[PDB]
Structures are given as C-alpha cells and as structure tokens.
Amino acid sequence: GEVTYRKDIKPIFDVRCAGCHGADAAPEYHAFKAEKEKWLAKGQGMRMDTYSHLIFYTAWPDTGALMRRLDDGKDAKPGNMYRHLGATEEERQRNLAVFKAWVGVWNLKKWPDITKEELNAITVTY
Numbered sequence: 315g316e317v318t319y320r321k322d323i324k325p326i327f328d329v330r331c332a333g334c335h336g337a338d339a340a341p342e343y344h345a346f347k348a349e350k351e352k353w354l355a356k357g358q359g360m361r362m363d364t365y366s367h368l369i370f371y372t373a374w375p376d377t378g379a380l381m382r383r384l385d386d387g388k389d390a391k392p393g394n395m396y397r398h399l400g401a402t403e404e405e406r407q408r409n410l411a412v413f414k415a416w417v418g419v420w421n422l423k424k425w426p427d428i429t430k431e432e433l434n435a436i437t438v439t440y
C-alpha cells in the first residue's frame with residue numbers, strides 16, 4: 315500500500331527531475347549556492363537523484379523546500395518546479411498526489427519556524 319521512494323517516487327523523479335538534478339548537477343546544495351553560474355549555464359540545479367539527496371529538501375536541512383517547489387498553489391502561484399510534474403494539469407495533479415503521500419504532511423515552513431512535532435510528521439518512507 316504505502317507510498318515509498320523505491321516504488322513510487324524514484325520512477326517519477328528519474329523521468330521528470332533527474333535531467334537537471336542528477337549526474338550533471340551540483341553534487342550538493344552548497345556546492346550549487348557557491349558557484350551558481352557554473353551550474354545554471356547548463357540549466358542544472360543540485361543533485362537530488364538518490365534518496366538521501368532528496369530527503370535533504372523535506373524535513374532537514376532544507377526543510378519544506380520540496381513541498382514549496384512542488385506546490386500547485388491552492389497567492390495561487392505554484393512552486394517553480396510544479397510544471398515538471400507533467401505535460402498536462404491532470405498528470406501534474408496525479409504526480410503531485412504521489413509526492414504528498416510520500417512526504418506525509420505537506421509542510422511549507424522553513425527550518426527556523428518549524429516545531430519538532432511537525433518534523434515528526436514527515437515520513438518520507440524509503
């Protein structure tokens with residue numbers, strides 16, 4: 315039943331996200347932030363193509379980022395990565411629904427403003 319990285323997220327990510335967040339992307343977040351021009355010039359972001367690399371953007375250290383960037387916006391600006399979830403709105407919604415199940419709670423808050431109880435709700439099953 316339960317939605318997991320191996321069964322449900324990685325198949326989507328490998329198609330829709332790894333083009334700019336895999337082998338050609340910055341090896342880590344701060345690697346990107348320190349030399350953005352290098353990566354941006356190739357249309358690349360930072361590595362998210364492994365489970366440990368992706369959960370970085372959920373509870374800690376970059377808490378809420380995956381939730382913020384994939385948000386469909388229901389002030390209604392979607393996050394700037396939502397478009398990558400599919401070629402039609404129906405596809406985007408279906409795939410967004412898989413990420414919300416995986417993450418647990420769709421918490422958009424940033425690290426300094428989040429509570430331990432809220433952190434507990436981020437499950438992110440492998």
Ligand code: HEM
Binds near residue numbers: 330
């Ligand atoms: C559904 C697939 C994708 C997911 C889940 C995803 C996720 C993310 C997240 C969470 C961030 C923000 C990292 C941070 O906190 O700073 C990000 C940034 C970025 N993404 Fe993606 N992304 C996806 C697809 C793509 C694609 C296909 C491209 C290129 C065509 C791309 C290019 C970038 C770039 C250049 C950044 C860094 C600049 C920025 O913050 O906008 N992403 N992505």
Ligand SMILES: C[As](C)(=O)[O-]
């Ligand atoms: C959130 As920090 C310590 O990388 O500025």
Ligand SMILES: [Zn+2]
Binds near residue numbers: 375
């Ligand atoms: Zn940092």
Ligand SMILES: [Zn+2]
Binds near residue numbers: 376379
């Ligand atoms: Zn971030």
Ligand SMILES: [Zn+2]
Binds near residue numbers: 330397398399
């Ligand atoms: Zn795309």
